[PDB]
Structures are given as structure tokens and as C-alpha cells.
Amino acid sequence: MEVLFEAKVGDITLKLAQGDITQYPAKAIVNAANKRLEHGGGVAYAIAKACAGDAGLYTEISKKAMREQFGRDYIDHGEVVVTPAMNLEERGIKYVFHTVGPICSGMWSEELKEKLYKAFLGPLEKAEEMGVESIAFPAVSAGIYGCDLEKVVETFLEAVKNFKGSAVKEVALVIYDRKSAEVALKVFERSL
């Protein structure tokens, strides 16, 4: 785990890190989920397995939490399901905040960008509501959803810049692989 960038944005200390988000020292981590919180692949599978031992168990608790929180078995972009982080709690991660980005499949548009913007902003607003001081994100939609990584990072930064609050004090973007983290660093440097 390595921190590549740190800056102040409003009341927030914003970091870019390369490494495994399930090991990042934040009180909440964000999951790049699908709309049904079926954690069958990607960072969503990694988080689910880290939290529950078997990803399917975390899918099951996620679906119960989503029904309780939203009254149905899917979420729309910007809605955030909160689940106990279970096995990650001992590392100081109390919650997983599940969000859902759009599927770009190699395309980009203003409509795709706004969906992704909501998927980044929603977890900041949920952190504020809950008094969670520190939160870490993955590059939502830059996995199999095929949204261009630079555009994804730009959109994340727009959400962080627009957000205002008194409880959230630390935000991180955590990217697993070095080459992608270095692309993110390029975006951070030209934007902050």
C-alpha cells in the first residue's frame, strides 16, 4: 500500500493510493457494485469475500440490507446500501457502502458521466449522514463496466470538489494495479 498524492479539498484531505481497498485505513469503504448487489466479480467479489469469507454470504446480507433500506432488490445510481463490514471491522473498516456506476462498454457521454457522478457523490452524502469521518473509493465503473479510467477519475474528483460537509474529513481513491494508479495520478495532478 502506497499513498501517491495528498491534497486539501475544502475540509477534506484527499489521497490517491495504490493497493487493496480492503486493507485501507478508512471507516467506510465503497463497493463498485451492480444494481442487485450480486457480488460475483471484480472489486465487489474481493470486498464480499474479505468481509464474509464467501462472497455469496455477503451478497445475501447485502440483499437483506438493501430491502430494508430501499424497499426493493435493486438500487439506482446515487443510492447507497450500507452493510456491516464484518471481518474488516477489526481493521477499523466499520461499513461497506455499496454504490452502482453506469455501464459504458468503451463509450462516454454526458448521461453516462452524470450517472457515475451520482455513484461517487452518494457515498460521500451517506458518510456525512452517518458521521463517518473517513471513506475510501475504488474506480467505480472502470472494471468490467468499461468506463475510461481517466474519465472515471475526473468524475470522482468533481464529486469530491462539489461535496460539502462537516463530518467527512478524509477521502481516498484506492486503485489496485500500479499502471492504473499512475493514470489516476496524472488526473489528480492536472486537476488539483
Domain containing 79 equals 2-192
CATH number at residue 191: 3.40.220.10
Count of residues for the chain? 192
Q: Are 97 and 126 in contact (CB under 8 A)?
A: yes
DSSP state of 15: E
The three three-digit cell numbers of residue 112, written as one number: 453516462
Largest CA distance in the chain: 42
Rounded CA separation 73/176 (Å):
29
Annotated binding site: 19-21, 32-34, 39-44, 140-146
Identify the experimental approach: X-ray
How many other CB atoms are found less than 10 A from the CB of residue 100?
29
DSSP 28-62: EEEEEE-TT----SHHHHHHHHHHHSSHHHHHHHH
Q: Which residue has the cell 452524502?
A: 125
CA distance 126 to 168: 10
Instruction: Record the cell numbers describing residue 117, joined without a space.
Output: 457522478
Q: What is the DSSP letter of 144?
A: T
Report, in this order, helix, strand and coil percent for the chain, each rounded to 5. 45, 20, 35
Tell me the CB-side half-sphere exposure of residue 128, using CA atoms within 13 A. Answer: 12
C-alpha cell at 109: 457521454
Annotated binding site for substrate: 19-21, 32-34, 39-44, 140-146
Question: What angle, rounded to 10 degrees, do the helices at 149-162 and 110-130 form?
Answer: 40
Distance of CA 39 to the CA centre of its chain: 14
Q: How many domains does the chain have?
A: 1
- Residues facing 100 on adjacent strands: 33
Strands 81-84 and 95-100: antiparallel
